[PDB]
Amino acid sequence: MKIAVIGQSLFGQEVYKELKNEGHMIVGVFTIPDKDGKVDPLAIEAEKDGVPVFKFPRWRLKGKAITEVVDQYKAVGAELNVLPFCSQFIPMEVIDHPKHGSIIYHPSLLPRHRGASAINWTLIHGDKKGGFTVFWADDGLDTGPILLQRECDVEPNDNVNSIYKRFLFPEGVKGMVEAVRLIATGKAPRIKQPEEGATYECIQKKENSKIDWNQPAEAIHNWIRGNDRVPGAWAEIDGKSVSFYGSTLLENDHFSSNGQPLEIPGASRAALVTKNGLVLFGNDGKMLLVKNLQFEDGKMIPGSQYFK
Ligand SMILES: Nc1nc2c(c(=O)[nH]1)N[C@@H](CNc1ccc(C(=O)N[C@@H](CCC(=O)O)C(=O)O)cc1)CN2
């Protein structure tokens, strides 16, 4: 069928490539503008194949569909919209235009963790199960009926990057392909998201990823890994904003005070700079080990090297 891909990044690119190689006609690609001479991988792949590429900075203005970009989108005659990591709300004029409507990839088990940072909040909350959903776009935000859903286990030391690379990206690409295949045969279902279990969390940015030291070690662990690598959990140390990466929960070594003590504004007790990284304490007296640190305008350095 004729497909318009509305999205961005490598995930969008791979979904594009896989749908193309299943024989679908990509009549158009709608991604984000170039940033600093960097072209989105989805736009790069499509232009190569000779597929129309659009880079609208926005779809709506004054809470109303921009008619010119709606007309440019309509022109390619999509029979189905596919939205692999689309960062903006798409007007219903566009969503409802194709014969088959529009499907969206969401990296959480909907209705849980609606929102733009679902993977982060999966880990911040300490969820044991994660996964992705393919759902039909409607007029709300991540509220549309489910087409298919796939689960995976969340590992205790998973960060955003590890669970994305291991499962959410590669199985997500397959999920989108399978969904399009189900639509092509008319078998794709529409399961209304249940009320029970619906949550929504705000997008994670640097501003709201600051660490709260007054939790048990496990909760701090979840916060750090839930924002690793982006946008990076951080806290003030020595009047510097320091970001934390590569947290693992730790039983031993205890203490061992073989490491070098580091005072941290607001922590339950002093951290420890050790051979294997920065040991931090939660208010339960238990430990997590942070392997990598980062200062404002700087490359990552090992936690072991904080003083050096
Ligand atoms: N029709 C329709 N269009 C959609 C979706 C939909 O379900 N229905 N789902 C969208 C994907 N999911 C989200 C969920 C939350 C946000 C979000 O909250 N973005 C912040 C970004 C904040 C920022 O970057 O500064 C905002 O305020 O716009 C964006 C896409 C794709 N477009």
Side-chain angles (χ1 to χ4, degrees), residues 152-308:
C152 70
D153 290 314
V154 178
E155 290 165 18
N157 295 323
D158 257 336
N159 60 9
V160 176
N161 282 46
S162 60
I163 192 168
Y164 187 65
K165 179 190 177 188
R166 183 181 69 253
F167 183 85
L168 298 174
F169 181 103
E171 293 297 321
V173 167
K174 292 184 200 176
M176 290 300 274
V177 170
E178 168 73 343
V180 171
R181 195 148 39 205
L182 290 172
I183 295 169
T185 56
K187 285 189 294 198
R190 294 175 166 271
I191 310 154
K192 175 178 186 288
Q193 294 190 29
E195 286 176 20
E196 179 179 315
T199 74
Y200 188 99
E201 294 85 39
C202 61
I203 183 155
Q204 281 302 100
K205 299 156 162 306
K206 200 65 176 187
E207 171 189 18
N208 58 338
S209 66
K210 185 185 171 173
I211 291 164
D212 176 15
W213 291 118
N214 295 317
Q215 305 174 81
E218 183 167 346
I220 297 168
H221 175 60
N222 288 336
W223 185 260
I224 296 176
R225 73 197 182 102
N227 291 291
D228 171 14
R229 308 274 323 219
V230 290
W234 64 272
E236 168 191 275
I237 310 177
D238 285 325
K240 291 286 182 158
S241 295
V242 175
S243 300
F244 301 75
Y245 306 99
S247 177
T248 56
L249 284 166
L250 204 65
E251 297 275 297
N252 275 40
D253 229 270
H254 81 299
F255 265 113
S256 141
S257 279
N258 204 317
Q260 309 176 273
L262 170 66
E263 295 301 326
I264 286 167
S268 314
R269 68 138 279 187
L272 283 167
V273 174
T274 81
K275 231 169 67 70
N276 304 289
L278 183 56
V279 171
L280 300 165
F281 289 90
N283 59 19
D284 57 348
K286 296 191 76 72
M287 304 174 286
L288 52 313
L289 173 81
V290 171
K291 275 187 298 297
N292 286 315
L293 296 173
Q294 181 173 47
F295 308 96
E296 314 156 271
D297 294 81
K299 204 171 296 299
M300 278 192 321
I301 64 129
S304 62
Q305 301 305 294
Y306 179 86
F307 286 121
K308 197 190 176 206

